Ligand binder design. Structure first.
Ligand SMILES: [Mn+2]
Ligand SMILES: [Mn+2]
Lengths: 7, 293
């Protein structure tokens, strides 16, 4: 969920 | 280069409250980059390693968890180590993390090994934190010096002719190990092709063959791709990193592939542990785990 380049 | 002084100062903060910095000099960090770069270029791009050894996945600047990993596994050279990449970005201490890793590579170049992850690439770590850390704590000239070093990291490793290791995963273009050995350095990571896939691809339980990858680059691959690759190259196991897994390690395709992720508490959508894999003298695999906070 951090942004799917990636939780 | 006073390597021992550098290592001592990096280790000095063991037992401090997490977050306490180690600020090496610009000249020391440049020496670490230049010397490690020469060692990377003198060793093969496809490493051939021997167990026993410890294998770690992503660290992402979580320096105090790197220190815990060494506390659990033994500080170099008490144990041999292979890291699978993604040393920088996201975490608050990418600089301490990569400097200790490079210092140990120079100090124990035959017993300590680092692979390239997709974040050891200027296009990625420009935007995911490492550029900002370098600009804040040093200058952008040092970030370029890091980039030159990252562009020379090896790409894959085979442990005792049985465990194939890389950061991301398999490639539809990977037919022979000689294709990896032919890759020339320095290189950037391309946005497609063999080198891209080795650093970016993912296994997927719901894909048959090769699929599209939600990251926007490279591919996914299924359990049958793994089995055929293992059979074709006479391997027992694929060991890779790159994906956050809740237990720190996660098996795939009937334990023919394992994902390692070594940075605990990385992710806001779910808790995760960090794991380090022990490979013993018979190639049996076990785990040491940093449980989530
Ligand atoms: Mn990655
Ligand atoms: Mn990562």
């Amino acid at each position: 969920x951090l942004x799917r380049x990636x939780x | 280069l006073n390597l021992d002084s550098i290592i001592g100062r990096l280790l000095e903060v063991q037992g401090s409250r997490p977050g306490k910095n180690v600020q090496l000099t610009e000249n020391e960090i440049r020496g670490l980059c230049l010397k490690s770069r020469e060692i990377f270029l003198s060793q093969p791009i496809l490493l051939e390693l021997e167990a026993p050894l410890k294998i770690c996945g992503d660290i992402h600047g979580q320096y105090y968890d790197l220190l815990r990993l060494f506390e659990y596994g033994g500080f170099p050279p008490e144990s041999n180590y292979l890291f699978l990449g993604d040393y920088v970005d996201r975490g608050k201490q990418s600089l301490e993390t990569i400097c200790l890793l490079l210092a140990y590579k120079i100090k124990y170049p035959e017993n300590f090994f680092l692979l390239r992850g997709n974040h050891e690439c200027a296009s990625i770590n420009r935007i995911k934190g490492f550029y900002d850390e370098c600009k804040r704590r040093y200058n952008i000239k040092l970030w370029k010096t890091f980039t030159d070093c990252f562009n020379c990291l090896p790409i894959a490793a085979i442990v005792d002719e049985k465990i194939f290791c890389c950061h991301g995963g398999l490639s539809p273009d990977l037919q022979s190990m000689e294709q990896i050995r032919r890759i020339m350095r320095p290189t950037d990571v391309p946005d497609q092709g063999l080198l891209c896939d080795l650093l970016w691809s993912d296994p997927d339980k719901d894909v048959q063959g090769w699929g599209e990858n939600d990251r926007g680059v490279s591919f996914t691959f299924g359990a049958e791709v793994v089995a055929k690759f293992l059979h074709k190259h006479d391997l027992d196991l694929i060991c890779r990193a790159h994906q956050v897994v809740e237990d720190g390690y996660e098996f795939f395709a009937k334990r023919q592939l394992v994902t390692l992720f070594s940075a605990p508490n990385y992710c806001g959508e779910f808790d995760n542990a960090g794991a380090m894999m022990s490979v013993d003298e018979t190639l049996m695999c076990s785990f040491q785990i940093l449980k989530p906070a």
